[PDB]
Design a protein around this nucleic acid. Structure first.
Ligand SMILES: [Mg+2]
Lengths: 264, 165, 249, 63, 87, 63, 63, 63
RNA sequence: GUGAACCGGAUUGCCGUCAGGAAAUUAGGUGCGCUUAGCAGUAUUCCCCACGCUGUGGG
């Protein structure tokens, strides 16, 4: 059930006027938030059509889904493309119903269903994290005299590849070896984009107390999160049209919420 | 007061385009045009954090609009009921003096927002008589307290005192 | 025990009390001239009509009432009129009538009432609960029918807005609240400014009983604080009547 | 009224009628003790009717 | 962070807090009257408040009668804001 | 039993009533100046109205 | 701005300020009375024709 | 103009020149009241020169 | 309860009836915003269940 579509956003052209979409694209936590309060619910849909209510994420349906932000030229106009697909029907008449400045052209819903059988030459790109659990999380190197104090911490650090090669034949080897698990293969792979992606997620806490109830009085906190990016393509030959559909429903890698998803 | 003087001095600093967009906003509230509100915020925000006494917001907006429209200069001792009355002595008491006199008394029974047009006609006949000086600080602090009748009666008695001399 | 019906009463423009020459009557208080209706006029207006009679022990042992002159909360504003009675039959010229002058004033008033313990019990008539029934009639019968006057040409029967009833036994009129006549500032009503002056006086004098307060649909609060200066910011017709009824007995 | 209607032909019609049957009449002058100052929305007739209806509310519940 | 670092009318990362129901302007404020709300629509709230009456009644961007004006003011904020000329 | 009839009329710029000097009638209601139309003028105009002609049966004459 | 060219001091400019302008599509209306003009010139037909023709030319060709 | 030319280098010389000599001033900016839209067969300089020639022939013949 | 009681200044009224504020006006001339810039990057990526310890469910 592919629901591939597009959300063409309004990049500005004057960094003097306020630019809502450009600022919104700089934080992937809020990018996921924006993409996730779409298709909200039918629970309180009959109450209000105006999106004027105190926000709570519990009312929104907790179905995991996917997106990816990219850039393309159609024939004559640069416009950043967001490609989404989900198991629920598209209803972007409420997510952007008072934030029309976020959009450039009204979004379009397509219908698509896959068929590849085995060994064709009609495949597409991919996005993934270069995340590996560390072999040697060496004992928490602390500061003060550039020393080492701690014991251990299993962390999902960035992939430390080799030092005598480039990653268009190192990460290429990596997903070429990864492909027979997920039910496909790579005969050619050249990377297009790599780097880091950043965000910020807020943590509600509780320190203070209230004299007539429980501790409503409390403070704020923010925390950062980082990921290693890899956008790349390939001419691929699917092993079987019976297990690759699960990979087309989950994606190579499972950042999902934070951009890196399935093959497109 | 040591707060309104800075407001008047900052108003005298305003250049031609700013008071042009203030001129275009006669009779219009500070909402339907973004640049007018931006100018008013720039003029009105920073004088509350430096001195404890500031004029009322509506008085400041009305005085800024009128100042842009007429562009006088600030001089102590040139309030409205002195120059008014001084020009009333230069009149024929038969017909024109009641006309201009009623034009002046229309101000004494009006709220702050609606006085834009009567103050406009009063300052128009002031401009016709070639008046350059107007005590903007004095006008502003008698206008921010315009709702108490002692200052209205003092202003009227100032008109009487300037008329009998 | 003593009943003080401190009552505010605005009036649409109409003349109610007339002197020899027809002017609204005036009083002197606070170093200013304020409009006045005579206590005899309003006291007879409380009598002489059957809506209140629904009371001869109270305005006759003599009688049982202290009704004050209606002191205006502001300065007096007497206006003048000019009427022409037409000829309505075509003569050689026009106009025929008396071509006289009338005169009127619009004012917001205040008054104070006094009914003591034995002054209501020895009033008696025939019952001992009559000493609560007649008072219960009175607390809103005093604000039932504006007197009389030139109503056929100046129709004014504006009902009162803010009504106090106190159970303080020491007889003191709150007229010293209106030592300064009430001026008008644009954000509040004249009645609202007068009620703020009454509230500001109420927060005094207690430094050196309760406040039973009437505001219809509580549009007028006695003080803009949670520390209410009456603590009884309620009121609806005969609810206050019954509450005074079981306050007395 | 047949005043200066030849010079000011103001023959406009009453934008409101309130007929109420009782044995104790009332003028809604106290509905406009507060002067009616218009806002950008609505008009003078609607603001006056709004203040009148507010007064009708608290003299139909409070009184 | 009660509203999860977000706006309320035009949901987006939030910066400041607006005040509704000016019974008291606030030295001690209860947490059920404020309104954490983003920069542009709080600027539109100041649009609507500074124009017309100042009073004590506030905007309350929850009941949808003060909606079209807020969005229109935000549109002219987006179109006409000069950041180099402050604010 | 008595009947109340209330109206709220907005009028074009007009002078329906004047005093001896020619000013429109004014009253100080609620501490502010309110424009006034005399009751006798309304009574006379309703007396001389074009629908009272079947009932207009009173004369106020010295001749 | 107004920029200085002599380097008598640090790299200043001089006088800064603003200009305001616009561009538009304009509509202009004229009306030349004929017998009133010929009464004003008292019977000079050819000078009146000169007036009307030169006005028709000067309204168009001049700005 | 030598503004920000160290980073962009736009030294683009001329496409066409209209130098005239007449007795009354005219501006062919009104030729481009219609904006020039690119057709897939010609470049915008040729298109703009065609639009300019259209309006130049208009003014030369119609005046 | 006290030179004080208890106590209306009451009713009848159209200010009405005639009125161009009209003749005349270039908003005028002067002006550069401008000097400086890789959107890149392996050797801790903030986490939580979670692997023979780097694959695996998401914030
Ligand atoms: Mg917002």
């Amino acid at each position: 059930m592919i629901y591939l579509s597009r959300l063409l956003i309004d990049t500005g052209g004057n960094p003097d006027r306020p630019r809502p979409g450009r600022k919104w694209l700089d934080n992937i936590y809020n990018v996921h938030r924006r993409l996730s309060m779409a298709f909200p619910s039918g629970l309180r849909r009959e109450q209000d059509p105006h999106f004027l209510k105190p926000f709570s994420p519990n009312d929104f349906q907790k179905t995991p889904f996917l997106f990816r932000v990219d850039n393309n030229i159609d024939g004559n106009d640069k416009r950043a493309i967001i490609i989404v697909q989900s198991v629920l029907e598209p209803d972007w008449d409420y997510c952007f119903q008072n934030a029309l400045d976020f959009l450039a052209a009204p979004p379009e819903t397509k219908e698509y269903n896959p068929e590849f059988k085995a060994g064709q030459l009609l495949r597409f790109r991919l996005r993934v994290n270069a995340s590996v659990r560390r072999h040697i999380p060496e004992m928490v190197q602390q500061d003060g005299q550039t020393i080492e104090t701690g014991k251990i911490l299993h962390k999902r650090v960035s992939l430390t590849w080799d030092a005598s090669s480039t990653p268009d034949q190192a990460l290429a080897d990596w997903l070429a070896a990864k492909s027979p698990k997920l039910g496909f293969t790579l005969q050619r792979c050249e990377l297009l984009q790599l780097g880091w992606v950043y965000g910020s997620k807020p943590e509600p806490k509780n320190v203070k107390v209230k004299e007539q109830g429980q501790g409503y009085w409390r403070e704020h906190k923010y925390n950062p999160l980082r990921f290693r990016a890899a956008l790349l393509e390939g001419v691929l030959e699917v092993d079987d049209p019976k297990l690759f559909l699960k990979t087309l429903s989950s994606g190579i890698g499972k950042a999902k919420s934070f951009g890196f998803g399935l093959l497109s | 007061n040591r707060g309104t003087v800075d407001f008047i001095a900052s108003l005298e600093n305003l250049k031609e385009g700013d008071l042009g967009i203030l001129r275009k906003l006669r009779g219009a509230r500070l909402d339907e045009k973004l640049p007018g509100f931006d100018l008013f915020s720039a003029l009105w925000w920073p004088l509350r954090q430096k001195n404890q006494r500031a004029p009322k917001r509506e008085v400041a907006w009305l005085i800024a609009k009128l100042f842009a429209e007429f562009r006088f200069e600030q001089r102590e001792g040139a309030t409205l009921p002195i120059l008014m009355g001084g020009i009333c002595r230069k009149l024929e008491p038969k017909k024109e003096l009641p006309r201009v006199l009623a034009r002046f008394d229309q101000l004494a029974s009006l709220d702050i927002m609606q006085m834009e047009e009567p103050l406009s006609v009063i300052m128009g006949i002031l401009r016709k008589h070639q008046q350059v000086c107007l005590d903007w600080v004095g006008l502003t602090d008698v206008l921010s307290f315009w709702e108490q009748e002692p200052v209205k009666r003092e202003w009227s008695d100032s008109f009487i005192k300037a008329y009998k001399i | 025990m003593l009943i003080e019906i401190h009552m505010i009463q605005n009036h649409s423009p109409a003349n109610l009390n007339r002197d020899d020459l027809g002017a609204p009557k005036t009083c002197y208080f606070g170093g200013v001239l304020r409009s006045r209706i005579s206590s005899q006029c309003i006291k007879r207006s409380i009598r002489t009509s059957n809506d209140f009679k629904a009371d001869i022990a109270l305005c006759g042992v003599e009688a049982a009432l202290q009704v004050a002159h209606a002191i205006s909360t502001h300065i007096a504003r007497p206006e003048i009129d000019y009427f022409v009675a037409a000829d309505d039959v075509p003569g050689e010229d026009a106009g025929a009538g008396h071509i006289g002058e009338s005169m009127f004033a619009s004012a917001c008033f205040y008054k104070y009432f006094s009914i003591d313990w034995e002054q209501l019990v020895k009033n008696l008539k025939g019952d001992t609960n009559l000493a609560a029934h007649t008072v219960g009639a009175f607390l809103l019968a005093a604000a039932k029918t504006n007197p009389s006057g030139k109503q056929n040409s100046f129709a004014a029967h504006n009902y009162p807005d803010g009504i106090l009833v106190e159970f303080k036994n020491s007889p003191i009129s709150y007229a010293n609240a209106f030592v300064r006549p009430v001026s008008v500032v644009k954000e509040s009503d004249l009645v609202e400014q007068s009620i703020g002056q009454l509230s500001n006086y109420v927060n005094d004098i207690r430094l050196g009983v309760i406040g039973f307060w009437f505001s219809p649909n509580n549009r007028y609060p006695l003080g803009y604080k949670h520390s209410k200066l009456a603590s009884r910011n309620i009121g609806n017709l005969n609810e206050l009547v019954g509450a005074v009824l079981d306050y007395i007995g | 009224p047949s005043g200066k209607q030849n010079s000011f032909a103001a023959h406009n019609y009453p934008d409101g009628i309130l007929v109420e049957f009782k044995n104790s009449p009332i003028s809604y002058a106290n509905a406009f003790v507060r002067p009616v100052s218009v806002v950008k929305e609505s008009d003078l007739v609607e603001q006056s009717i709004g203040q009148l209806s507010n007064y009708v509310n608290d003299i139909r519940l409070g009184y | 962070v009660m509203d999860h670092a977000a706006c309320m009318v035009c949901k987006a990362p939030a910066t400041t807090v607006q005040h509704v129901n000016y019974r008291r302007a606030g030295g001690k404020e209860i947490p059920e009257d404020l309104r954490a709300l983003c920069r542009l629509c709080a600027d539109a709230c100041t649009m609507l408040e500074y124009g017309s009456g100042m009073t004590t009644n506030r905007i309350d961007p929850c009941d949808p009668i003060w909606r079209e004006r807020i969005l229109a003011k935000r549109k002219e904020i987006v179109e006409f804001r000069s950041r180099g000329q402050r604010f | 039993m008595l009947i109340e009839i209330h109206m709220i009329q907005n009028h074009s710029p007009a002078n329906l009533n004047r005093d001896d000097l020619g000013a429109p009638k004014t009253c100080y209601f609620g501490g502010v100046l309110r424009s006034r139309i005399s009751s006798q003028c309304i009574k006379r105009s309703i007396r001389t109205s074009n629908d009272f002609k079947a009932l207009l049966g009173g004369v106020r004459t010295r001749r």
